[PDB]
Amino acid sequence: EVNARIEPFLRTTPRPLRLPDGPPCSQRSKFLLMDALKLSIEDPSHEGEGIP
Amino acid sequence: EVNARIEPFLRTTPRPLRLPDGPPCSQRSKFLLMDALKLSIEDPSHEGEGIP
């Protein structure tokens, strides 16, 4: 009964992964991604590390 | 001898003004004019009264 019997892996044996049920998942990123919006200035003459 | 006799003004009577002699005159303007030089920045995004 102590053995390593080999179930053969056929094109039929693997099922799709079961994803959990529940309320829909929430955004948990630090900052916004696709929703993010930016106020932009063109700063030409001053190049290099400034003051944020 | 008390009269207002009229010396007539002819094309011949007026001489060129005599300009004084001496060492050459010096610049006495507050700031430089044609000799002046400027360090320039393009400041687009910030319009209106800033800090000099």
Q: Which residue has 């948990």 as its token pair?
A: A28
Chain A residues within 8 A (CB-CB) of chain B?
Answer: 41-46
Give the count of Cβ contacts less than 8 A between chain A and B.
10
* A34-43: long-range pairs with CB below 8 Å, 24+: A41/B45, A42/B44, A42/B45, A43/B45
What are the helix and strand counts (H, E) for chain B?
A: 0, 0
Q: Which residues in chain B are closer than 8 Å to A42, comparing Cβ atoms?
A: 44-45
Give dist(CA B51, CA A21) in Å, integer. 61
- The CA-based angle B45-B49-B51, given to 5 degrees, is 95
Chosen for mutation from A39, A40, A45, A46 (greatest number of chain B CBs closer than 10 Å) is A45
Give dist(CA A33, CA A40) in Å, integer. 17
Q: Which residues in chain A are closer than 8 Å to B39, comparing Cβ atoms?
A: none
Q: Which residues in chain A are closer than 8 Å to B41, comparing Cβ atoms?
A: 45-46
